[PDB]
Each structure stands twice: as structure tokens, then as C-alpha cells.
Amino acid sequence: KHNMKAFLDELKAENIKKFLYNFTQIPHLAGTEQNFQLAKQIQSQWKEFGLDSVELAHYDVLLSYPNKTHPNYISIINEDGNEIFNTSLFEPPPPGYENVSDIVPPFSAFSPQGMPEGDLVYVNYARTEDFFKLERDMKINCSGKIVIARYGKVFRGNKVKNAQLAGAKGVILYSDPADYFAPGVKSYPDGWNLPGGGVQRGNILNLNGAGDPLTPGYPANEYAYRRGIAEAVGLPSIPVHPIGYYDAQKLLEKMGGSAPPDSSWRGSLKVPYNVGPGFTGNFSTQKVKMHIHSTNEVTRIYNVIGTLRGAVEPDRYVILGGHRDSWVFGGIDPQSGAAVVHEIVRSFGTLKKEGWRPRRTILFASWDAAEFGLLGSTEWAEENSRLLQERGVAYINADSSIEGNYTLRVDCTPLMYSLVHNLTKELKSPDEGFEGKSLYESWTKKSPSPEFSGMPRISKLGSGNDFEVFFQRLGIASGRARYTKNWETNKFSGYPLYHSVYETYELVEKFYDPMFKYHLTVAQVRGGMVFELANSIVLPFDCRDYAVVLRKYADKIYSISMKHPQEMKTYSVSFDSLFSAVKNFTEIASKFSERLQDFSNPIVLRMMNDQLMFLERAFIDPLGLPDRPFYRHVIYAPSSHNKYAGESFPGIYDALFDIESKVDPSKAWGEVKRQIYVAAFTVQAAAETLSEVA
Amino acid sequence: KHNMKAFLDELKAENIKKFLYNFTQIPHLAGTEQNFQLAKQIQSQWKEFGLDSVELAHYDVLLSYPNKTHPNYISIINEDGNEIFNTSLFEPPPPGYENVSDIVPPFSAFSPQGMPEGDLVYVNYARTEDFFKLERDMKINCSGKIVIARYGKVFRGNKVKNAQLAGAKGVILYSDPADYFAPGVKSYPDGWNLPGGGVQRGNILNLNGAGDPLTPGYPANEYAYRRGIAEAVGLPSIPVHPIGYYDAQKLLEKMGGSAPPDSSWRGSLKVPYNVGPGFTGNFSTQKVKMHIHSTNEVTRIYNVIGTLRGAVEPDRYVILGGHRDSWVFGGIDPQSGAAVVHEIVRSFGTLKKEGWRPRRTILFASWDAAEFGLLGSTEWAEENSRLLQERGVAYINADSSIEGNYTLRVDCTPLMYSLVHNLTKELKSPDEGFEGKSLYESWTKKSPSPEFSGMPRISKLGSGNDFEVFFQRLGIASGRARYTKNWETNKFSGYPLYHSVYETYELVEKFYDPMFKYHLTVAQVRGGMVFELANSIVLPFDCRDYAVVLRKYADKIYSISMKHPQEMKTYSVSFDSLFSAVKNFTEIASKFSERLQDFSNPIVLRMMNDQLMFLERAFIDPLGLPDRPFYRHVIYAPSSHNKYAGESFPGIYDALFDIESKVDPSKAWGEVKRQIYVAAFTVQAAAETLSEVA
Ligand SMILES: *[C@@H]1O[C@H](CO)[C@@H](O[C@@H]2O[C@H](CO)[C@@H](O[C@@H]3O[C@H](CO)[C@@H](O)[C@H](O[C@H]4O[C@H](CO)[C@@H](O)[C@H](O)[C@@H]4O)[C@@H]3O)[C@H](O)[C@H]2NC(C)=O)[C@H](O)[C@H]1NC(C)=O
Ligand SMILES: *[C@@H]1O[C@H](CO)[C@@H](O[C@@H]2O[C@H](CO)[C@@H](O[C@@H]3O[C@H](CO)[C@@H](O)[C@H](O[C@H]4O[C@H](CO)[C@@H](O)[C@H](O)[C@@H]4O)[C@@H]3O)[C@H](O)[C@H]2NC(C)=O)[C@H](O)[C@H]1NC(C)=O
Ligand SMILES: *[C@@H]1O[C@H](CO)[C@@H](O[C@@H]2O[C@H](CO)[C@@H](O)[C@H](O)[C@H]2NC(C)=O)[C@H](O)[C@H]1NC(C)=O
Ligand SMILES: *[C@@H]1O[C@H](CO)[C@@H](O[C@@H]2O[C@H](CO)[C@@H](O)[C@H](O)[C@H]2NC(C)=O)[C@H](O)[C@H]1NC(C)=O
Ligand SMILES: *[C@@H]1O[C@H](CO)[C@@H](O[C@@H]2O[C@H](CO)[C@@H](O)[C@H](O)[C@H]2NC(C)=O)[C@H](O)[C@H]1NC(C)=O
Ligand SMILES: *[C@@H]1O[C@H](CO)[C@@H](O[C@@H]2O[C@H](CO)[C@@H](O)[C@H](O)[C@H]2NC(C)=O)[C@H](O)[C@H]1NC(C)=O
Ligand SMILES: *[C@@H]1O[C@H](CO)[C@@H](O[C@@H]2O[C@H](CO)[C@@H](O)[C@H](O)[C@H]2NC(C)=O)[C@H](O)[C@H]1NC(C)=O
Ligand SMILES: *[C@@H]1O[C@H](CO)[C@@H](O[C@@H]2O[C@H](CO)[C@@H](O)[C@H](O)[C@H]2NC(C)=O)[C@H](O)[C@H]1NC(C)=O
Ligand SMILES: *[C@@H]1O[C@H](CO)[C@@H](O)[C@H](O)[C@H]1NC(C)=O
Ligand SMILES: *[C@@H]1O[C@H](CO)[C@@H](O)[C@H](O)[C@H]1NC(C)=O
Ligand SMILES: *[C@@H]1O[C@H](CO)[C@@H](O)[C@H](O)[C@H]1NC(C)=O
Ligand SMILES: *[C@@H]1O[C@H](CO)[C@@H](O)[C@H](O)[C@H]1NC(C)=O
Ligand SMILES: *[C@@H]1O[C@H](CO)[C@@H](O)[C@H](O)[C@H]1NC(C)=O
Ligand SMILES: *[C@@H]1O[C@H](CO)[C@@H](O)[C@H](O)[C@H]1NC(C)=O
Ligand SMILES: [Ca+2]
Ligand SMILES: [Ca+2]
Ligand SMILES: [Cl-]
Ligand SMILES: [Cl-]
Ligand SMILES: [Zn+2]
Ligand SMILES: [Zn+2]
Ligand SMILES: [Zn+2]
Ligand SMILES: [Zn+2]
């Protein structure tokens, strides 16, 4: 038979290993010739594997690169203006590379140019609450200071936005061993820890879903009209540069002014972690000076788009997508995902060559420029938004398949919870100690649900990856899965060698997944999801699972508001409409489920499949969230404080955030009430899409 | 058989006459008890006629009413402050009414309160070009003046916006006999002309599609959060009041200052039509003083919504809608349309009682508060936007069935051109001299297409009626048809007794349509359209007709730009992308049509029916047009200078309008190029929805 088992058994760990090696021998930086060549290779292989068509979709978007003849670096500068200490111009290459060319040196993509000098202030993780503590509790003023922040906890672009609004004139990001050196394991090449010369690259934009900074709303095609740089979306206004912890030690060791307010501000280096401003007495006249010369430039990028046409519903699309561009070799990010996608295409293509076709169309995508702000997926979605909105069933993401070797991680819409639970019950656990047990069993034991006994944890989708445009802009049911670590407090910090030159094929083969069994497990989960979505007669979504979580989020947002009972009294702030809506959604979703179970009629079926497909769509508000027009889902948006994290009822959440500090409480609470109304209405409207149609 | 002929033959002129009489005995002003009672009556009758369900959908929206104990009026005031002339407090009621209560006196709905006094300036029709002529050519300044304008040519809200931006402190609107008294016919009650005491009511908002001024984007339901009055959408900032031509004569007769610039500024009254400012020498110290005391108030309105469930595709909606509220008796506006809808429901219900059901669901609507800014249709569409966007096939409007007795008038999307031509070829002409000939034949002879021999004229949809939210906001194929006059230059001015107390059942039965044959003809056209849309196996849309008009509009907008060849050279303004897109649309639409003709497969059919249904949808831009977020169709929007008129390529049109006057030509031409890009992209994207799906 040609069934899911046939598809799944065809997948091989050894093939994933071979493709990973193949994709990680040279850098594949977005906008470079090396990455165009890999695009053309993937296009050629996907054709050979059997897909019906495979095309390149290209766009010309704003990218950012260091100046090769004018290196970025940071100095401590004495009173005479002599640079007495300079940060590194590059990371020491790992063994056997040392002669690889075109390794981009560490930089913060999209930093403007500048040479600011000033006194340092240390701002911990540069989170919203870190700046609150500095400004409000310690009365330290960052205006005209250079801030130095440790990576971790939140997306780096949020750090830079927060530094900017505090009045900083520059930001230095660094990797502290507290967050990037796991106790008892050795530095690369002899283990998976970050060495002191290692540095994490990454962009520092605040695009809020816009895609290419110059063309928000529309694809960056050949005739595109572009904003001027001063009106571009999301660009930082102050210079920014990342360094490793050997260099950070030299900048922090001399710091004076106030002590750290408490131990949550202290990293692992042998320094006081004083907040500053400036250095201790003997060095008080020394300053820090940044030298940033990177340039932004419009550059062509290439997505590879493969189609496997559906036999019965060719106008319904199930999309498996992940990016191809990397900062350097991309041994984990993204090639551990891209290799998994390659093997999934190969397995589907094997079935196709034997005469099989899935019920619905499957689209496979190799996105470009994800590292520069999800630009490739976003421009493509902007180009095809009408097709996706009326035909998009689901999007499964496929960035890195591993970030640890402990257990499964799934983040997805509630509509896919039942699909995930069911599929994982049918897959074998790859974990030591769980041989002959299901993946569901190992996952649930290692990552228990906080809410339910005998269930695994599944997180909300945030952002920082290519499902953002499909889920938060277009309202297409989306999910992602990978193997992960057991380091709760580091969830959003990245694995130690994240976006460093040390992220190589050897890292994976030696330390993370020698037998490629975790990669295989993830290929089974992602591929199994795609298979069921593209083949099940009734779409494998359960609207009742959304009803359950909506009630959880409504309790949560009500609890936040109830921290302010006097104001809720004064301004008559009622959550009654939102709970009413959630109750109705629960009642209607229950009845719809009964009909779906109780209904030979392909019209009723497809009518019902359309109701299932358009349910995620119904949570979209065409007016968007306040000042973030591309985050249109009313239930989920990326946290305004941390792009990686999802926030539920974001419009109400942001209206309540720090409300006790607002100067006009009447206005602020009026906006809370407005967002309650919008949320209650959207939940009720979504519920009504599940009612009988006439 | 139960076919279109059965449906059409069941329609009777005599029934339309009886319903019209029934709907026009008392006023049915929005928000009044009389109009709620008629809603409940229609709900009851539609149930009796056979519909599956009939419900009231109610909303609480901002309405506007005179103060009953503090009448609105205008004075000429002498130097002492004595009011030596007062305009009327009411229109002389027509014969047999004179004891009807609750006739709302003439007023401009949504006028703010005020008692401004000043000198008059006469501004012709208060069009954009009239103000250009005054300010630019005659150097007359309206700042702090009261402007007096004649009704006609453009929507009254555009007049008031234009007066406001000219700095007027008040606006007086009046009906000139030149525009509202046809030569050789008598005044009401002895003919269909406007008497000197008659006055045209109407709202003066500039909502640009927003619906209820207090809740843009969301339905005005029970828990709605409302803007404060100062942030409401579309409200005028200066007092406004309408008068008849006996009163206008008294205000204009004393006018001094400059002569009219030319004869296009002269109406038919026996006055000089001097522009002012102020009165001639002897009266120079007299002023004009307005007294406006109307109030805005949130008031419940009721839509009646009837459903006839589809037998095969119940989740596809074909909507026939028209409003029920009137300014006074509504003998033409809207009851001549509402009576036609009532008889259509009765005829469909007759077929249903004999066991028939249409293929798709038909929804019938009796909208409320249309006179106060299309509020009932818009709030309902805001509430149901997700259902309409994913299921809406078409909307056929049904306001007044007559505005003359000369020939047919149709305004619709290009997708319905072929449907209209075909249906009209099968219907009998009601016209004298065309007995035994088709409606197509009489219509084409009396209203020839400007472009094509042997074809009738069909206009673009503008606005000023309840299809606005469905077409320009949601992108649902829409159309309208009625019998019309032969008075080209008056097309947007209204028939003489428009929105006056004289618009009665007697007006229609005696002067417009004694035999109710034109009403019957219109019931056949509107009902026949609904029938074909709800019953044809393949939706009766022809995408090739859109290709033809797109090329016409692209030539037109290019010709406008080419008035500025030096600037197109300087700023490299190319229309090449737009023509390319139109060429591609033409090519793809031709191939799609071949497949639609060449394709027993209900999936392919419905796939193809979805491509047809979503084609109008594809012209929607979710970001809207500049500063008009609710006008989202990129091909058509209501003219920024006249809400009644449709404009094609509106975003490019407005970017080019008066561009020679802009202070920064680089910026202005940059915005023209931006709008070219948006248009080319949207046309290409729409074309791509007709490509093979995979
Ligand atoms: C969840 O679904 C339920 C339906 O099962 C839905 O119930 C609806 O609630 C609204 C608002 O509560 C009801 O609205 C009432 O409608 C009646 C006419 O049917 C009106 O007379 C009422 O207005 C009077 O009372 C108001 C409240 O005191 C006054 O403010 C007002 O001035 C009037 O005096 C009121 O409009 C509606 O009838 C029911 N519909 C039903 C039962 O079918 C509920 O709204 C859904 N939740 C959400 C968030 O949508
Ligand atoms: C109407 O449909 C046609 C398809 O039938 C579609 O044609 C496409 O036009 C674009 C833009 O003209 C072509 O884009 C080119 O793509 C090639 C690779 O395929 C690139 O190498 C080209 O870039 C070079 O040349 C440019 C122009 O001089 C330079 O600006 C650039 O820097 C590069 O040097 C260019 O991107 C595209 O290939 C075709 N696609 C086809 C033929 O299938 C057309 O765009 C449609 N119209 C609209 C308005 O969409
Ligand atoms: C990655 O694998 C690809 C595909 O096998 C290799 O590309 C092929 O290489 C051979 C030898 O040069 C050529 O003859 C083929 O035409 C190439 N096929 C393509 C591009 O489709 C490539 O060599 C491998 N790269 C590495 C670093 O191992
Ligand atoms: C840090 O780098 C700077 C820049 O290369 C060094 O300063 C330069 O040194 C050369 C040779 O002495 C001078 O001629 C340049 O004019 C200096 N450029 C400057 C100050 O911008 C500096 O010596 C380096 N510092 C250390 C500790 O190595
Ligand atoms: C996950 O599997 C469960 C158990 O098989 C599925 O639930 C069953 O579905 C069938 C078909 O509708 C029903 O007859 C059973 O009563 C259901 N059992 C339950 C709810 O306990 C469930 O549908 C699957 N989820 C998917 C496919 O998304
Ligand atoms: C318009 O027609 C309606 C429906 O025939 C009339 O309302 C009915 O009137 C009779 C007499 O009062 C009642 O017994 C019915 O219950 C009413 N039916 C309804 C409201 O559904 C109404 O009288 C007519 N109005 C005018 C002015 O002729
Ligand atoms: C126009 O109407 C105004 C208001 O009714 C009239 O002026 C009023 O006349 C009465 C009786 O003489 C006075 O007591 C009021 O105080 C006046 N009110 C004002 C000036 O606001 C005026 O007489 C009317 N003019 C004409 C020509 O009939
Ligand atoms: C209007 O009627 C014309 C003439 O009948 C229809 O065009 C014909 O459609 C049939 C079925 O596709 C074709 O076989 C003929 O070749 C067409 N004749 C032509 C184009 O001259 C047309 O489809 C009708 N329009 C509708 C129903 O919207
Ligand atoms: C790189 O270095 C210097 C900076 O002035 C100069 O040679 C060249 O313009 C730079 N390249 C850029 C800005 O892309
Ligand atoms: C922070 O410092 C700068 C000093 O130039 C000043 O302009 C700003 O107002 C200060 N803010 C506070 C709250 O002290
Ligand atoms: C893999 O798992 C083992 C066993 O828990 C652990 O000691 C090792 O550090 C893990 N490797 C990585 C990279 O997490
Ligand atoms: C109507 O007339 C007067 C205006 O002051 C007053 O009796 C009453 O408040 C008014 N009604 C309103 C404003 O609705
Ligand atoms: C129009 O008149 C007013 C007089 O108060 C003045 O403020 C305004 O600037 C004038 N504009 C022109 C163009 O004369
Ligand atoms: C109806 O038609 C006749 C004949 O052309 C015309 O004289 C009459 O004025 C028309 N009535 C109306 C109200 O247009
Ligand atoms: Ca873009
Ligand atoms: Ca509203
Ligand atoms: Cl992922
Ligand atoms: Cl109409
Ligand atoms: Zn990645
Ligand atoms: Zn990355
Ligand atoms: Zn009307
Ligand atoms: Zn009207």
C-alpha cells in the first residue's frame, strides 16, 4: 500500500546525514553566489526526486554586510585617544576550516554606521524589566551612554529597541558563559560549548512581520517601488556589534559606578558586573569606542518552490517550508532542517514514481534570507497572498531539526494538537531507556503538560521563524517540531554555538546526533504531519482544542487585569463579553464536531473541510494590531518584549502592560476596553464560521 | 418545470403596486417606532412567503435628528440684529397628508449645532473645480464666510467637505430650478417637478465606507466600545442646512461682490448669481445667520435578514439587498425598490412551496439606516465579514427601481456584463414603440455604449448605496439596475422630488409608472440576475470582460499622466508594468475560459467556481487606499470628489489629481510611481488566481 507507513519507512537517517554533510561544506550567506548555487542544486535534485514543478522565485531585498576593507571593531580608548584594547576582527576558525574563504566576520546585520565613544552602562539582558530596574529603581540614566548587554532570554532586536528608547548611543552584545557554557562540557572542538573567541551573529531589526524593509505589503519584484532608507521599516538608529566573552571580560572588568542590584544580574565571568556608568577611578578617563562600517544594500535572493500536485483537491495547499541561507556553515541552523526537508521530498517523490499522489497539493519551500528577517518567506507570501488565503490548509516549518538531544519540542496552533498527539503515539521513541516505547510516551514523560496529566507540553507559536507570515499575517494553521534540550531558563537563548562559525557538520555528527536518530524522528513528525494534512479525507483539525485554550487565555488575561481592581471599578472594565464569546465558541465547536462525525457527500465534506480550513483564518483582523499592521491574528502575536515568545490576547495584553505608569488612566483603560471588545467580537465571529452555513 | 421562466412569470405588476402602497402610507425614518414596526411586518411576511429563516439583526448606531422644540432655520439679520427674513420651518405637506404626523422637517443629518452669522459667498455646485475657480482664478476667499451652494452634480457630503477645507463657517444647500425643475412639466401635485417650498433632505457625512461613525471596523453590537464624538468618523465641523428655491431666491437676490465667472454658474432663478462676498451696497450691513440645533444620538436600527437555503451549495451566498428606511414616505426612495424585493421573495417562496430550492443559498435583506450613511448594511457586513468573504458569490442591490421612465440603467462589475446582456435579451421591453422587442434591444438603442456598436452602456459602480461595503470593502461581485431618465448632465443630481416630502405613492402611480410595467421589468432584471447567480451550475461570470475594461482603464490613467510629459521624463514614470499585468490578465483569462468550457467532475467545477467567486476578491488590498482604509478594491473606488461616481485605478488617479499644484514634485511623482506598482501587482496577482492551481 501507499499509506503513511510506506512514506515513513522510506525515510533514512543515513540520507539525512549525507545531505547535511553536503549542505555544510562552505558558507551559504544570503545574497552570495554560494547560496544561489545551492538553490540551483536543490532545484535540480527536487526535480530528480519526482516533484511536478520546481522553480526559483527571486526578489531584490535590503541585506546588510560588513565592509571587507574596513573591519568592524570596538576599542577601549585612553584620554589621548590611543586605542589600548581592540576586540577581535574574526572568530578563530575551527579545525580543518582555517583556510575556508568568505566566512563573514561577526556583525549585527542592519546596524547603521558610526564611531560613537562614551561611557559604558551594563544592562543585564537589556529586557524591558532590566531597563525599568535601571531607570526606575536605580535611577541610572542611559542617555548618551554605550550599553553593554548579554545575549539571552529575548530576541536581540528587542534589546536594541529597548536600548534605543532608553537613549543609548550604541549597543554591544556579548555571550556570557552563564548562558552559553553548560557546566562540565568542553568548548568546541572538543565539546559543544562556546569558546571565548566565539561570537553570535544575527540581525537586530524590529520588522514586526513586514518582510523586506523597503517594500512592506508588496513583493520586492522587478518593478517594485521602494521606500527610501529613512522610511524603511525596522532599522535601528544606533550602532550595534556582538563580541565573545574573552573580549567582554576586558570591557566589563574596569566597570565602576553602582553594584549589580542583585544576583540575577551577575553572569559567570570573574568581574563585579557593576552597572556603571563608566569605569572605576583609575580608569575613569578611558572611554569605549565603536567602529561600525557595515552597509545595507539591495541584493537578489532566491526561494526554491516545489509542487506535488494533489489528485483530488489540487487547489488546497499543504506547505512544508524552511530556510537555506546560513550565517556561516549552518550545521544546525538551518541545514539540520533543510536536510530533513530534502529527505522528505525524496520519500514523497518515491511514492509518486510508483503512481501515488497525495489528495491535496503539497508545496515544498527552501527559503532565502531568513537570517535577515524572514525576508524570502515573507516576500513570497506577499506575492501569493490571495492564493494562500483562499487555498492554504497548513504550513509546517522546517528550520533546525535539533537544538538539544533531550526530547521533542512542538509549538503549533491548537487545531493541530490532536494530530500531533495521534501521530506521536504511532512513532517509535529514539530516546535511551524508551526503546520499544512510543515518542508520545517519552515526550510526555520528559516534557509534561503544565495543565493536563498524561499529556505533553505544546507551546504557542511565537516568531523568529518562517511560519510568521503564514500564521500571524495570513491566518494559516501552522506548526513546528524539533528535538530540544532540558534547560528551561535558556529556552529563548539558543544553544551554545548558535550563529557562530563553530556550528558545523562535525558539531552535529560528534556531539548532537551521531546516529542521526533524532533527525530521523523529526523527519517522521514533520513528514507525518504533512502526510496527514495532505491526505486525510477530513482535515485533521479539532476545533474543540481551540475552545479549551481560549478559556485558558481568557482566564489569564482577566487575572492580569484583576491586579488593578480599583481601576476596573472606576472605568467599568468587564471581561463578560469575552467569556461569553469563549462559551459560545465551546458550544458551537462541540456541535460542529458532532456533525463532522455524523455527516458519501463530497459537498458537505468539503463544505466542512472549508469550515475547518477557514477557522484559523477567522482569527485574523484585517486592521491588524495597534501599530503592528502585519500581526493580524487576534489570539496570538509575537510578544512586544520578545519576538521569539508568543503572547495570547496580545492586543489586551499590551493595553494592560505597565498600565499603572500611564499618565492618563482614563484613556489607557478605555483602550483595554476597546481591545476586550475586539477580542470578544473576533472569538464570536470565528465561532460563527462553525455554525450551520444556512 | 421550476426554471427561470417559472420564477419570472410568477412576478406581477399588481403585487408590486399593492406593496408599494402598503410601504408608503406613513414615514419610516431610521430609528423610529414606525420603521421597527415595518421591519417586523416584513419579517412576518417573508416567513409566510416561505423563507427558511427570517431574523432581525439590530445595532446601536449614531443617528441625527432635529430638535422638535427648537427648529432649524436661516435668517437675514439687519445691523440691529432683527431677523427680517426667515426660511421655512417645514415643507407644505402634499394633498391628503397635511395631517400626517412625524414628518421630519428638512435638515442636513449630522450637522453640528451652531448659530454662525456672516456674509454669503455663492460657490455654484461647491465642486472641487468650483472652489479652484473661486480661490485660484477669482481670488475670492471663503474663510469665515457662509457658503451657499446649489445641490446637484456631486454628493452633498463632498460639497460640505470642500466648503470646510475652504474655511467656510457654515453651508446652505438649495435646490435650483435649473437642476430640479424640468421644462414644461408642472410642480407636484400636478406633475413631477419640485415646488418652490420643496426641500431635499440627506446626510452630509464623509464616512468613506466606515459605517457607524462610532465603531469603524466592528459591528455596533451590545458590548461595542465607541469612539467619543470628537474622534468619530466623517462628521462635519460646520453647520449645514438645506432650503428650497423660494427661500434661496430671497438669500441670493441681494448678493453683491463679483459677477458669476461664466454662464455655467448661473441657475434659472431671476437673480444675478453674483459670487459675493456679502450683499450689494444698500444691504451691505445685513448678514446671514444660521440656527441649527439638531442632535446626534445613538439609536437602535433593525435589518431584516431572510435565508433560502441552497440544495447543493448551501455555503455559497447570493444576496439581494435594499434599504427600508426613508426620509419621509419613500415613494421612490426606497420603497419602489423594497416593493420589488418583496415580490421577488414572494415568487421564490412560491417555487419553494412546490418543492424547489435554488442550487446556492439566497439571502434577502431589508437594510435600516441607509439614509444615514449605509449604516445597516455596513454594520451587518462588519459582523459577518468572515462568512461573506469566504462564501459571498454576489450582491445585487435593490434601492429605488425607478428614477425616470426612459430606459434601463445598470451599474455593475465587468464579471456580470455577459449575464446582464444575456438576461436582457430574454426579457420583453416595456417601452412604447418596442412592443414585442427585447429589453436588450430597447436599452441598447436608448443608451448606446460609448465603446461598442450594438451594445448598451453599463456604468462602473460608485457609491451612495448599500452595495458599497460588499464591493469596495469586501470584494464581492456586485450589481444594480433600475429604470432611469434621459438627462445626462443630471445623472448624479437626483430626480426632482428626491428626498422631499412630495415623494409619495401618488407620485409613482400618477407620473412615473401607472401600469407598474417599469417596476415589473426591474423585478425581472434583479430577480433574473439572482436566479442565475444562485442556480447556474457554472457561475455566470466572464473573466474576459474584466480584461477588456482593465485595458480601457490603463489607457485612461496613462493618458492623464501624459498631460505631464516633462515630469514623466524627470522622474522616470513608466506605466510599462501596468500594461504588462493587463496583458497577462488578458492571456490567462483567455486560457481559463477555454478550460471552463472544456473541463462530470464536481471538484474541478467547484474549484473553477471558487476561482470565479474569488476573482473579484483578488482586487482587494488589505492595506486599503491612502487614508481610506475601507475602500480596498484597487480597480474601483468612489471618487474622492463625488461619492456617487466610480473612479477607476483610484489610487493612481488621486496621486495624479492636481499634481501640477504640489509643492514637492519629487514626492508627488514618487507616490504616482508607488500607486502604479500597487496596481500592476494587484492586476498580476488577480490574473494568477485564474492560472492552473498546481
Ligand atoms: C453568545 O451567544 C448568545 C446567543 O445564544 C448571544 O446572546 C445574545 O446576546 C445579546 C446581548 O446580550 C442579546 O441582545 C439582546 O437582544 C434583545 C432582542 O433580542 C434586546 O431587546 C436586548 O436589548 C435590551 O437589553 C439590553 C441589555 O440590558 C439593553 O442594553 C438594550 O438597551 C435593550 O433594552 C439585547 O440587545 C441577544 O438577543 C442574544 N441572542 C440570542 C439569545 O439569540 C451572545 O451575545 C453571544 N456572545 C457574544 C459575545 O456574541
Ligand atoms: C507578465 O508575465 C510575464 C511572464 O510571461 C512576466 O515575465 C517575467 O518578467 C520578469 C521581469 O521582467 C522577468 O524577470 C527577469 O528574470 C530573470 C530570471 O528569470 C532575471 O535574470 C532578470 O533580472 C535581470 O534583468 C533585469 C531587467 O533588466 C535587471 O533589473 C536585473 O538586475 C537582472 O540583471 C529579471 O529578473 C521574469 O523572468 C519573467 N518571467 C517569465 C518570462 O516567466 C511578467 O513579469 C508579468 N508582468 C507582471 C507585471 O508581473
Ligand atoms: C552536494 O551534492 C551535489 C549533488 O550530488 C553535488 O553536485 C553534483 O556534483 C557532481 C560533481 O561535480 C556534478 O557532476 C553534478 O552535476 C552536481 N549535481 C548538481 C549540482 O545537481 C555536489 O558536488 C555536492 N557538494 C558537496 C560539497 O559535496
Ligand atoms: C587597535 O586598532 C587600531 C586601529 O588599527 C590601532 O591604532 C592604529 O595603530 C597604527 C599603528 O600604530 C596607527 O598608525 C593608526 O593610526 C592607529 N589608528 C587609530 C588609532 O585609529 C591600535 O594600535 C590597536 N590597538 C591595539 C592595542 O592593538
Ligand atoms: C486522534 O485519534 C482519535 C482516536 O482514534 C480520533 O478520535 C476518534 O475519531 C473517530 C472518527 O471520528 C470517532 O469515531 C471516535 O469516537 C474518536 N475517538 C475519540 C474522540 O476518543 C481523533 O479524531 C484523531 N484526531 C485526528 C485525526 O485529528
Ligand atoms: C400593510 O400590509 C400588512 C400585511 O397585510 C398589514 O398588516 C396586517 O394588518 C391586519 C389588520 O390590522 C392585521 O390583522 C395583521 O396582523 C397585519 N399583518 C402583519 C403586520 O403582518 C398592514 O395593515 C398594511 N398597512 C397599510 C398601511 O396598509
Ligand atoms: C424670524 O424668527 C425669529 C425667531 O422666532 C423672529 O424673532 C423673534 O420675534 C419675537 C416676537 O417679535 C421676539 O420676541 C423674539 O425675541 C425674536 N427672536 C429672535 C430675534 O431670535 C423674527 O421676528 C422672525 N422674522 C420674521 C421676518 O418673521
Ligand atoms: C451568454 O450566452 C452566450 C451565448 O449562448 C454564452 O456563450 C456560449 O456559451 C456556451 C457554453 O460555454 C459555449 O459553448 C458557446 O460557444 C458560447 N458562445 C459564445 C461565447 O458566443 C455565454 O456563456 C453566456 N454568458 C453567461 C452565461 O454568463
Ligand atoms: C569599504 O571601506 C571604505 C569606507 O570608506 C571604502 O573603501 C568603501 O567605500 C567601503 N565600501 C562600501 C561603503 O561599501
Ligand atoms: C537622562 O539624561 C539626559 C542627560 O543629557 C537628560 O537629557 C534626560 O532628561 C535624563 N532623564 C532623566 C529621567 O533623568
Ligand atoms: C546528549 O545527551 C547526553 C545524555 O543526557 C548528554 O550528556 C549530552 O550532553 C547531550 N548532547 C547534547 C549536545 O546536548
Ligand atoms: C431641544 O431644545 C432645547 C435646546 O436647548 C432643549 O429643550 C432640549 O435640551 C433640546 N433637546 C435636545 C438637545 O435633544
Ligand atoms: C483667506 O482669508 C483669511 C482672512 O481671515 C486668511 O486668514 C487666509 O490666509 C486667507 N487666504 C488667502 C489665500 O488669502
Ligand atoms: C414618462 O415618459 C413620457 C414620454 O417620454 C414623458 O413625457 C414623461 O415626462 C415621463 N415621466 C417621467 C416622470 O419621467
Ligand atoms: Ca515586501
Ligand atoms: Ca461599525
Ligand atoms: Cl522549526
Ligand atoms: Cl439600486
Ligand atoms: Zn534558522
Ligand atoms: Zn538563525
Ligand atoms: Zn435609497
Ligand atoms: Zn435616499
From Swiss-Prot, chains A, B:
> What is catalyzed by this enzyme?
Release of an unsubstituted, C-terminal glutamyl residue, typically from Ac-Asp-Glu or folylpoly-gamma-glutamates
Q: Outcome of residue 371 to Q/D?
A: Complete loss of activity
Residues recorded as binding substrate, renumbered to this chain, are 156, 203, 370, 463-465, 480-482, 498-499, 643-644
Statement: the UniProt record of this protein carries the keyword Zinc: yes
Cofactor comment: Binds 2 Zn(2+) ions per subunit. Required for NAALADase activity.
What switches on expression, per the entry, is described as: In the prostate, up-regulated in response to androgen deprivation.
Q: Quote the InterPro entries the UniProt record gives.
A: PA_dom_sf (IPR046450), PA_domain (IPR003137), Peptidase_M28 (IPR007484), Peptidase_M28B (IPR039373), TFR-like_dimer_dom (IPR007365), TFR-like_dimer_dom_sf (IPR036757)
Q: What is the effect of changing residue 67 to A?
A: Loss of glycosylation. Severely reduced enzyme activity
Query: What is annotated about its quaternary structure and interactions?
Result: Homodimer.
- Identification of the protein by name: Glutamate carboxypeptidase 2
Per the UniProt entry, what species is this protein from, by scientific name? Homo sapiens (Human)
